[PDB]
Design a protein around this ligand. Structure first.
Ligand SMILES: CC(=O)N[C@@H]1[C@@H](O)[C@H](O)[C@@H](CO)O[C@H]1O
Ligand SMILES: *[C@@H]1O[C@H](CO)[C@@H](O)[C@H](O)[C@H]1NC(C)=O
Length: 246
């Protein structure tokens, strides 16, 4: 399992956690030098457990689907929580079985539903290491409205940073001060599946995307990604959602 302690955390130790997170996701091939997540995995092998410790040393364990880096649920003390989605319900068959009770959250895990439940878009939710500490704290005591906002933070500070080096760097800059995500950060999150697909299709297309992917850059300008030479491909993205799952 992969572990992260907010007590004494600094950009370096958080860098190490995110490296571990990526290293725990299995793959058999690379496509243009980027690990390609597997089409599927059967049983409990499908799910990685992340141990997260807040500053006061309290912990949660988060279950992550290794084929797509999606959070399915988490354990907080003796209570398990799982999204209201069939994927998570299936996961509940394999992790945290020894929880004293199982609570199903009143939303699915996708950003759009989480933002509704939280009552705000992640454009206005500050993220960073302090926010992750807070998020962990919030998830320890069930509130479902507060938990939605806390999961938006957790997702972005764990999964999305694993997917993209630019996002991991954003979080490192927010090690001791939160800040809502840049628009580019949001655009990357939203393009992961698309980018993953197009990079894969590029393999029999001389490195050229079948359909260009539209991002936003750090300056706020709308940018077109058309091929694998782009820095998004060459430097930023770190994991590829397998087209079998798109
Ligand atoms: C990446 C992660 O860990 N969790 C969620 C996932 O449940 C959902 O499928 C999608 C958002 O629309 O990506 C993240 O928000
Ligand atoms: C591919 O992308 C690079 C960077 O965007 C650009 O300079 C180049 O003209 C593009 N080449 C092709 C063949 O699309």
């Amino acid at each position: 399992d992969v572990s992260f302690r907010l007590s004494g955390a600094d950009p370096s130790s958080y860098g190490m956690f995110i490296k571990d997170l990526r290293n725990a996701l299995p793959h058999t091939e690379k496509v243009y030098n980027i690990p390609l997540l597997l089409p599927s995995v059967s049983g409990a092998g499908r799910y990685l457990l992340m141990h997260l410790f807040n500053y006061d040393g309290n912990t949660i364990t988060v279950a992550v689907d290794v084929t797509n880096v999606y959070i399915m649920g988490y354990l907080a003390l003796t209570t398990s929580y799982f999204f209201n989605e069939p994927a998570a319900d299936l996961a509940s068959q394999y992790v945290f079985r020894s929880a004293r009770r199982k609570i199903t959250l009143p939303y699915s895990g996708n950003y759009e539903r989480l933002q509704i439940a939280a009552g705000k878009p992640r454009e206005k939710i500050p993220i960073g290491l302090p926010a992750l500490d807070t998020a962990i704290s919030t998830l320890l005591h069930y509130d479902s409205t507060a938990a939605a906002g806390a999961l938006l933070v957790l997702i972005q500070t764990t999964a999305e940073a694993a997917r993209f080096k630019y996002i991991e760097q954003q979080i490192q800059e927010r090690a001791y001060r939160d800040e809502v995500p840049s628009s580019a950060t949001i655009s990357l999150e939203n393009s992961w599946s698309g980018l993953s697909k197009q990079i894969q299709l590029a393999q029999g297309n001389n490195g050229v995307f079948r359909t260009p992917t539209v991002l936003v850059d750090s300056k706020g300008n709308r940018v077109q990604i058309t091929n694998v030479t782009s820095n998004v491909v060459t430097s930023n993205i770190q994991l590829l959602l397998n087209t079998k799952n798109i």
